[PDB]
Amino acid sequence: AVKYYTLEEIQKHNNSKSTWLILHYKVYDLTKFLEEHPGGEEYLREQAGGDATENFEDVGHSTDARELSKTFIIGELHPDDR
Ligand code: HEM
């Protein structure tokens, strides 16, 4: 089973208690990761509530970071919004 979120609901998660973002159609809840992110939290908050795939790939994340990102997935972008 997979949970699908719309762009409308994702955009609402960009505040002090909730930070979500999209990477390759998958939705990530990075709320508790902000402080641990090697790159800092400014880059994450700035992209919160939207699709950060291009920025993510632009910086060029390691295979380890990508493996780690998987633990933060909570669902996928609704097919109709793709
Ligand atoms: C769940 C997603 C993410 C995880 C788990 C994550 C993890 C990491 C890790 C482990 C590093 C260390 C270097 C490496 O292994 O590549 C890193 C660096 C970095 N990340 Fe992320 N990252 C994520 C999302 C993002 C996003 C969305 C942005 C930008 C919009 C971003 C910007 C950066 C920057 C600027 C660095 C520093 C690169 C440098 O100094 O050369 N990261 N990230």
Curated annotation (Swiss-Prot):
Alphabetically ordered keywords of this record: Acetylation, Electron transport, Endoplasmic reticulum, Heme, Iron, Membrane, Metal-binding, Microsome, Transmembrane, Transmembrane helix, Transport
Q: Tell me the protein's name.
A: Cytochrome b5
The molecular function terms of the Gene Ontology recorded here are:
heme binding; metal ion binding
Signal peptide interval: none
Q: Which residues bind heme?
A: 37, 61
Q: Does the keyword DNA damage apply?
A: no
Q: Where is the Cytochrome b5 heme-binding domain?
A: 2-78
Q: How does it sit in the membrane?
A: Single-pass membrane protein
Q: What family is it from?
A: Belongs to the cytochrome b5 family.
- What top-level branch of life does the organism fall under? Eukaryota
Q: Does the keyword Transmembrane apply?
A: yes
Predominant localisation class: endoplasmic reticulum
The organism's lineage is: Eukaryota, Metazoa, Chordata, Craniata, Vertebrata
Q: Point out residues bearing the modification N6-acetyllysine.
A: 3, 12
Counting on the full-length protein, the chain here runs from 8 to 89 of 134
Localization of this protein: Endoplasmic reticulum membrane; Microsome membrane
Q: What's the stated role of this polypeptide? A: Cytochrome b5 is a membrane-bound hemoprotein functioning as an electron carrier for several membrane-bound oxygenases.
Name the GO cellular-component terms.
endoplasmic reticulum membrane; intracellular membrane-bounded organelle
